[PDB]
Amino acid sequence: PRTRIPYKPNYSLNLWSIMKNCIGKELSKIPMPVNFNEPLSMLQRLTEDLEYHELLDRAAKCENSLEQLCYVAAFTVSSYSTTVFRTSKPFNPLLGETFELDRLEENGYRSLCEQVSHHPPAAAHHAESKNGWTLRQEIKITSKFRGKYLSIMPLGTIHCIFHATGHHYTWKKVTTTVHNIIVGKLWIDQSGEIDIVNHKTGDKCNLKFVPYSYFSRDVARKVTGEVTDPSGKVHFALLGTWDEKMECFKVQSRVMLWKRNPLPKNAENMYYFSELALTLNAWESGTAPTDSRLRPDQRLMENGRWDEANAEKQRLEEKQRLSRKKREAEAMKATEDGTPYDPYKALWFERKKDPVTKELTHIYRGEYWECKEKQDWSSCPDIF
Amino acid sequence: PRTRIPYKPNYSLNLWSIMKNCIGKELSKIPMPVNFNEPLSMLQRLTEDLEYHELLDRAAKCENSLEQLCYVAAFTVSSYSTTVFRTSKPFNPLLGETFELDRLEENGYRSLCEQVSHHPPAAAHHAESKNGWTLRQEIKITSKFRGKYLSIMPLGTIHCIFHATGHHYTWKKVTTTVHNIIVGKLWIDQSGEIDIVNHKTGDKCNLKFVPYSYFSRDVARKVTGEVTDPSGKVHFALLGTWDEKMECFKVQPHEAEESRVMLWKRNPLPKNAENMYYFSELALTLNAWESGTAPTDSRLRPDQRLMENGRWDEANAEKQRLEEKQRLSRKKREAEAMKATEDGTPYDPYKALWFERKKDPVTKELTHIYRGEYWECKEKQDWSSCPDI
Amino acid sequence: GPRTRIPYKPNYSLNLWSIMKNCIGKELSKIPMPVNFNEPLSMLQRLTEDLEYHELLDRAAKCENSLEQLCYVAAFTVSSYSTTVFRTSKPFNPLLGETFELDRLEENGYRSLCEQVSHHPPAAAHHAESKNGWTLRQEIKITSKFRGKYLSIMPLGTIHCIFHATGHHYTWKKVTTTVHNIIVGKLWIDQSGEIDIVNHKTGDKCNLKFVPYSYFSRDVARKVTGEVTDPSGKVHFALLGTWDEKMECFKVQPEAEESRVMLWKRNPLPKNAENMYYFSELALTLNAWESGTAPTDSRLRPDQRLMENGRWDEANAEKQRLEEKQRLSRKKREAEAMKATEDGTPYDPYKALWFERKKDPVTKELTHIYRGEYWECKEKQDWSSCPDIF
Amino acid sequence: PRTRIPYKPNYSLNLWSIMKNCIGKELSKIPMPVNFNEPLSMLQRLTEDLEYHELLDRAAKCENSLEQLCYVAAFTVSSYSTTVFRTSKPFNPLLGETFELDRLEENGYRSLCEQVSHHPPAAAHHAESKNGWTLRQEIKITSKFRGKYLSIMPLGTIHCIFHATGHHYTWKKVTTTVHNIIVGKLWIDQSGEIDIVNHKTGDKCNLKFVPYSYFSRDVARKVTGEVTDPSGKVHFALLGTWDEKMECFKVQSRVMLWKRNPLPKNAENMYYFSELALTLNAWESGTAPTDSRLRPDQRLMENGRWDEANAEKQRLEEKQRLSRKKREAEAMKATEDGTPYDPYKALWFERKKDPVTKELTHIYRGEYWECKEKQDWSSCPDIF
Ligand SMILES: CC(C)CCC[C@@H](C)[C@H]1CC[C@H]2[C@@H]3CC=C4C[C@@H](O)CC[C@]4(C)[C@H]3CC[C@]12C
Ligand SMILES: CC(C)CCC[C@@H](C)[C@H]1CC[C@H]2[C@@H]3CC=C4C[C@@H](O)CC[C@]4(C)[C@H]3CC[C@]12C
Ligand SMILES: CC(C)CCC[C@@H](C)[C@H]1CC[C@H]2[C@@H]3CC=C4C[C@@H](O)CC[C@]4(C)[C@H]3CC[C@]12C
Ligand SMILES: CC(C)CCC[C@@H](C)[C@H]1CC[C@H]2[C@@H]3CC=C4C[C@@H](O)CC[C@]4(C)[C@H]3CC[C@]12C
Asked: Where is the sequence biased in composition, kind Basic and acidic residues (chain C)?
């Protein structure tokens, strides 16, 4: 495993200087350097949901459906434990970029995500486990800069299947807002409601993320929840804070669920990366040529070689723009010649209608690991 | 009731010349004149869903919940009956623009739409009827021009509640594509699946819109469907074409009339509709001037009235003026937010007038719901709105 | 090895829509066009190209499970359409007595033979026996219709595949083929419809659905889905793919890609095939000179060889000569029938040489079955020299 | 009911003079006057298959599927009882021409035929009975004149459904040849095999029609048959002649006997019409405007007005030709303007894939009798 990555240098670049006039625009359309990023891609950032994968591993061994949903809800809230300290923008991943995590013997799963689209940005992620579950999602990130705060709505639906019982849990994301852009330290806060539904049994769960108010009495970053049966009974209750702990009680004896693992040593200068976040961008053999570990500007930023990372990002973005212009030119030729035109489609994911949520979602085809074992790539375009 | 609008002028403007290099761009970001529009706003076009409101009126008188879902399924398809001929772009409504339709004695409902946002574009629609139902929705229109076709996806969820029984139906729209852009003559095609769900009684309905193919041996523009009970299966089956008719039969594993419970037939277009933008009989009466409306109603938009009366060149100049006023107002709001952000002073962002953004308790989505205050303010005739139009 | 390169296609600018402008609703056989839109192959050779992926049938003969064998046969039915994606040229309308052989026992493992049995309506009988334990036969009557936007081609007929070792007799029809975008020039082909395979020995069935290409669709282009059922109605194997590239048959139980039983990948086009009528690696060696064939073989047709070497201007005149020769011969047959009917003398009508028109015992239809006399006569080289069609 | 039609006039026109040079052509492409026709359309001639509907009426009351198949097999031969003397060509129906037979109380069925396609000629026929059966078919008439004889092959598949048991019998027609055209004295002969298959039980039946030979092997116009179970046993045996009778014996002695109804009085001068064939072209109320009873040239020829009937047939053929040219011009405009084009479709029949025969056939949609009840029509083209 790989820990201790080089620290963040001090270049004194005022964030407000670039985002001064860019009020009301999307974060993707805001030209930014690499100084305010972290050496991880959005795919690597998204795969971190499996940081507390033991919750799903223990949930697979629950006979009671309601108690299993209590475990699933704790897994939904556990993902925001990295949001307390990590206040950096991960690299906007390229159109064909992917990222794998083949950690079956050490952890028990094989994760794989790939950018399905860039206009608009969307990323499909799928992870298979040997303990009897599978987690998949397609996240389309939308954002808006209002001046005082930066609002981020990671749109999309997350699925979690349990092969032993057939339980299919699904839930949406919560809205995330980042404060203190002009001056002072940066901090993040989630607010809204997450509604989990089990389509196999009919169980539901409602989690409420309370926004921070000074005179609210409500503790900061508080999360309350209730898991209900198809009839109406409240049964179990959830309480905690997404910054520290989360416990599951019963109503009619306290079971307790999730406590975040502490940050590694001297992590204050390593972008506040978790112990799992360190091993994400470690070089690995047998990955696809479009994996995030091979992105040049990301590695150039990880080792502290800035200024050149800006130029490498500029070149990579110009490459993607020329590829898009060529694809549009092919479509323009095909529409005038009368020939059919087949647009861009994702490589390892297919856009089909989800049978339970009735949503156009990207599902894993099931041929990435086979091709990785056989080491037959090439297919993947020259992205970097 | 207005029965005929001035005819459509003949201006020779090549559409492909404008969208030649505009490959991959959004329709809102496509600089085009008023020549390829219709004298209706997107709010009025969205209000046209109530054209076949008799289906919901008869659905309110259905004791069987499954048969009521059979009526609602035909109501979902009835909205696409107007797309067969009308291949014109409705006016992109301004930020504060609204549109009312207070037709209780003539039709039996009160419709109200308002453009809720422009980044991204969203429009909230709410219409309550005295016959026992209410229809509401928030439509965020997304579009993309890929060359061969221009795809339009009206994202959003539509609700239809029956207060007497409490039935709450919800369904999404289907993907619409307009083809043949290089050459003048345009044609439209719908394709995809509509999934209706009743949240009070667990029964569901699935409609399948078959795409038009170069060589297909099915009927053109055919739609098939099934009505299933909660945790069961097919109780009714419906089939037809969104070009003309839609029939809903019953299954029991003779001729056609014996096993058919509900038929829907579209009313034909009025006389000389070839020169009136192929407007329906209901579409003609939408942009007729009415007294007692809000100052932001679509009937008062200068671009539409200038184009309806055939004064297209002035409509182009006026649309450029209206869009520049909206852009300057947006930049002024951005400057106010920037100064409040630097000084620490509080800032009140833009909020919709007649709609409030709350989480829907059944669909768990942040949608704009009508705050019952438009009709009450209309009777007292006090309007503290904006000067967008 | 065999022939791997033919002379290139010349660049002759002839507007196709100018000829098919007024001929709306007519058959492709009755529409007068030059040789510019043809390929140096006959319909008999084009039909013989069905045996391109015979490895699927070779492996199917070695399947103990009947249902598992049906997956290989089902992939063989779709494999023939892998060549239609780019090759959009009209094969020569063969003469009435024209034949075509393919005696490839050591190199491929079969003996194929085709003969035009009739021209009114057009019909061609094909029969190919293999030493790997199977036999493929068919009679294809090609009907067509030009509707304006597209040219519809329906190769009507029933094709059979028998396995001598087990007695399995598979039967299936072809799918509808349409060539679109004729008005401008850059024309393209698409198949659509359903193939229904039936095993008459066991009762297993298979259904393949070819989805038509549509203006807007969010599924894969040229997609084909299929299911194989036992005589009771239970779906054992399921297959999916695209006739543009691949076709896979997995197993269902009514994780990943571990249930895969049979994958079929199309053989890529040879080098510089861009200018060789997009011929496959097998399509090139079809019109290569062969010894010991019948005098009515397609390799001896003057129009194909005259056009293959790039002399299209003379190939048009030779096509006119052959068509007028065939028409005069048919007028001679009609005059003989009229004289024999007025004189009361018996009349012996035209009958096929290497095929016999008998009732098929399985499909109960009047089909042309191989008589069993072509290869034997080829060994002794005693051709009848009576047709004289070229 | 109609029991006597006007007699056939005597016109001295040599048929061989017209078909002298038309050897090898299709009967549809051979220009002929009305002198060699009969006052019936091809739809009415095809509807004459229901002449011996009592066979299906008794077949619906048969418990044994094999014994029922003997009745069905006799019904297949019963249709050829009229061809022994009737040597006239029915009128080639127009594109929109239909023909109804609403005889529920008198016979027990509702028949409807429609010319579904022209070029090539095709006719769909459907008849539902209240006695427990339904008969449907789509017949594409193909022909060829070889000089001595005219070969006619009525291609298509005929279906017979029994609602009580679900038995679905299917069989094709047999080839019919008309000889002695040069002299003038016409005679007809059938030859070939009819193969009936029951898809619900698996029973099969094979009928052999022997052609006329000079060496006269036993009886003329003989028909032999066998009724077999799905295993292989020849439970029943069939014998008879399509000239008179047809009987079904048992093997290890008479279950299903078919006797031909004789021709009515003075039928020698009425085109040898059967007792049912006379009532076919009788005027009926409440019919569609495209029914064969309203065809002008056909009725003009029925009353002996031949010379004028030729001109009326020329008018109808040119009208249909102009309509087809208009359809072709619409398609030519649609292909160049890029607008979609929807070709001609049948009115009362839909061309779908049959679930049992897996073939593209025209099935009755079920809307003719309802529209007859409401008496609207109009929607039908101006065919006459
Ligand atoms: C520095 C400023 C300008 C921008 C910072 C943006 C950062 C804080 C945003 C951008 C996208 C966000 C992520 C979007 C989606 C998810 C998945 C969820 O299951 C956990 C939170 C997580 C992982 C978010 C964490 C915060 C995040 C990384
Ligand atoms: C002029 C060219 C470039 C663009 C034309 C775009 C037209 C055809 C598009 C733009 C907006 C579209 C509408 C958006 C939403 C709805 C509501 C739905 O319930 C029925 C279809 C309907 C009413 C659409 C019909 C087609 C439409 C009017
Ligand atoms: C160029 C224009 C004028 C006409 C083009 C006609 C071409 C495209 C047509 C004519 C006959 C057709 C062939 C007829 C039969 C078969 C056998 C089938 O198993 C695969 C397709 C195949 C091999 C067809 C391919 C397309 C084909 C070659
Ligand atoms: C006058 C000369 C030139 C041509 C005469 C053609 C006549 C004899 C032919 C043309 C079409 C034929 C019919 C076609 C189909 C059927 C249906 C079958 O179930 C019984 C025989 C029957 C009813 C045929 C009887 C003979 C028939 C009427």
From this structure: 298-342
